Amino acid sequence: KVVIIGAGFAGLVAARELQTAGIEYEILEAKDRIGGRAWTEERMGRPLELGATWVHWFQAHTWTEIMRYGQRTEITASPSGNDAHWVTDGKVVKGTEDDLDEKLTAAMGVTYEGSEEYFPNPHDPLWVLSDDFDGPAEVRERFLSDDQTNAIDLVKEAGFDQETIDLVDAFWCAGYIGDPYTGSALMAKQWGALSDNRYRVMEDITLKWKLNNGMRSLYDGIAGDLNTDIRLNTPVAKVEHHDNGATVTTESGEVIEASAVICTVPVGALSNIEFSPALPDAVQSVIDDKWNSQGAKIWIKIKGHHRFLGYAPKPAKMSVVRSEYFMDDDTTILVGFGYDNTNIDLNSIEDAQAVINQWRDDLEVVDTTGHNWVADKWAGQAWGTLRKGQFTQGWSLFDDIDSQLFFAGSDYAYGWRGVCVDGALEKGMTTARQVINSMR
Ligand SMILES: Cc1cc2nc3c(=O)[nH]c(=O)nc-3n(C[C@H](O)[C@H](O)[C@H](O)COP(=O)(O)OP(=O)(O)OC[C@H]3O[C@@H](n4cnc5c(N)ncnc54)[C@H](O)[C@@H]3O)c2cc1C
Last residue of a domain, one of 334, 357, 383: 383
Query: Is the shortest distance between the CB of 424 and ligand 1 below 6 Å?
Result: yes
167 & 211 share domain:
no
Return the percent helix, strand and coil in the chain, to nearest 5.
35, 20, 40
Closest atom of ligand 1 relative to the 207 alpha carbon: 8
230 & 150 share domain:
no
188 & 295 share domain:
yes
User: Could you give the CA distance from residue 62 to residue 5 in angstroms, rounded to a whole number?
Assistant: 21
Closest atom of ligand 1 relative to the 235 alpha carbon: 42
Phi, psi for residue 15 in degrees, rounded to 5: -65, -45
Phi, psi for residue 169 in degrees, rounded to 5: -55, -55
Q: Specify whether the CB–CB gap between 160 and 107 falls below 8 A.
A: yes
Cα 275 to chain centroid, rounded: 25
Query: Roughly how many angstroms between the first and final C-alpha of the chain, as a whole number?
Result: 15
User: Could you give the CA distance from residue 333 to residue 325 in angstroms, rounded to a whole number?
Assistant: 5
Q: What is the DSSP letter of 278?
A: P
- What does this entry list as its resolution, in Å? 2.0
Long-range contacts of 50-54 (CB under 8 A, 24+ apart): 50/297, 50/369, 50/370, 50/371, 51/215, 51/297, 51/371, 51/373, 52/215, 52/383, 52/420, 52/421, 53/210, 53/215, 53/335, 54/78, 54/205, 54/206, 54/207, 54/208, 54/209, 54/210
48 & 104 share domain:
no
84 & 150 share domain:
yes
89 & 167 share domain:
yes
240 & 369 share domain:
no
Query: Is the shortest distance between the CB of 295 and ligand 1 below 6 Å?
Result: no
Query: Is the shortest distance between the CB of 420 and ligand 1 below 6 Å?
Result: yes
Last residue of a domain, one of 383, 398, 432: 383
Domain that holds residue 157: 79-205+291-383
Q: Is residue 257 left, alpha or beta, with left meaning phi > 0 and alpha meaning psi from -120 to 50? A: beta
Query: Is the shortest distance between the CB of 11 and ligand 1 below 6 Å?
Result: yes
User: Could you give the CA distance from residue 85 to residue 405 in angstroms, rounded to a whole number?
Assistant: 48
Query: Is the shortest distance between the CB of 214 and ligand 1 below 6 Å?
Result: no
Last residue of a domain, one of 340, 360, 383: 383
Measured CA angle at 99 (ends 150, 149), to 5 deg: 5
245 & 394 share domain:
yes
198 & 256 share domain:
no
Q: Is residue 201 left, alpha or beta, with left meaning phi > 0 and alpha meaning psi from -120 to 50? A: alpha
Mutate to test the pocket of ligand 1, among 54, 61, 236, 421 (most ligand atoms within 8 A of CB): 421
Neighbours of 155 (CB within 10 A): 24
Q: Specify whether the CB–CB gap between 282 and 267 falls below 8 A.
A: no
Closest atom of ligand 1 relative to the 419 alpha carbon: 15
Torsion of CA 88, 89, 94, 97, to 10 degrees: -10
118 & 128 share domain:
yes
Count the domains in the chain.
Answer: 2
Give all strands (DSSP E) within 99-244, no chain letters: 209-211, 236-242
Q: Specify whether the CB–CB gap between 252 and 42 falls below 8 A.
A: no
Residue nearest to atom 5 of ligand 1 (CA): 52
Q: Specify whether the CB–CB gap between 422 and 60 falls below 8 A.
A: yes
201 & 182 share domain:
yes
358 & 236 share domain:
no
